[PDB]
Every structure is written in structure tokens, then in C-alpha cells.
């Protein structure tokens, strides 16, 4: 019967789509930290300094 | 006579193909809700917030 294969290949299709989704979720995590830090650090740099009074 | 079996196995073949179809219809239902909700919710999250006036 044709049905048998249709079932089995569906199982595969789901699994592949899961793996594909995963990499984006993971990568978004990696980028989150890197981005946030870069902004903070850059801000502190511009904002700060010393001045010679006399 | 050969005809007798040909009939009987057809009955089976139909039934199996029905069961196979069913799982896809069912699964599409399950996914429908989950997808729709995920979109709505995510949208409201980004769109909303509070601001301190003074």
C-alpha cells in the first residue's frame, strides 16, 4: 500500500524542519549577547574621561 | 479463481490509504492552532510597553 511510505517520509520531513529551525534559535542566542555587549561597551567609552584642573 | 483475492486486497488497500491520509489531516489541525497563537502572541509582545513621563 502507498500509505505506508507516505507516513514514513512525513516523519523525516518533520525532523529535518526541526533541525533547520534549531540552528536559527541557537544562532539568535549567540548573537544576542555579542550585540548587547558591543552597545554597552561602546557607550561607556564615549561617555567617560578625565580633565586636568591645574 | 483469481478475481476473489483481487477484490479482497483492494478493500484493504483503500482502508490503509484512508488511515494514512487521516494522520496528515489531524496533524494539520494540531499545527494550525499552535502556529496562529505563536504569531499573535509574539506580535503583541513587541508592539506594547510603558513610558515614564516624569
Q: What is the resolution of this structure in A?
A: 3.1
- Nearest residue to A10 (alpha-carbon basis) of B23, B32, B36, B13: B23
Q: How far apart are CA B15 and CA B21, in angstroms?
A: 10
Contact criterion met (CB below 8 Å) for B25 and A10: no
Q: Which residues of A touch B21 (CB under 8 A)?
A: 3
Q: How many CA atoms lie within 13 A of B48 on its CB side?
A: 6
Contact criterion met (CB below 8 Å) for A10 and B24: yes
Number of neighbouring beta carbons within 10 Å of residue B45: 9
Number of neighbouring beta carbons within 10 Å of residue B23: 13
Q: Which of A2, A3, A5, A18 to mutate to test the interface with B (most CBs of B within 10 A)?
A: A3
Q: How far apart are CA A2 and CA B17, in angstroms?
A: 7
Contact criterion met (CB below 8 Å) for A4 and B17: no
- Nearest residue to B32 (alpha-carbon basis) of B24, B22, B43, B42: B24
Amino acid at each position: 500500500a502507498i500509505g505506508i511510505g507516505t507516513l514514513i517520509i512525513f516523519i523525516a520531513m518533520v525532523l529535518v524542519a526541526a533541525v533547520a529551525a534549531a540552528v536559527l534559535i541557537n544562532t539568535s542566542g549567540f548573537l544576542q549577547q555579542k550585540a548587547m555587549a558591543t552597545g554597552k561597551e561602546s557607550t561607556e567609552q564615549v561617555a567617560s574621561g578625565l580633565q586636568v584642573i591645574r
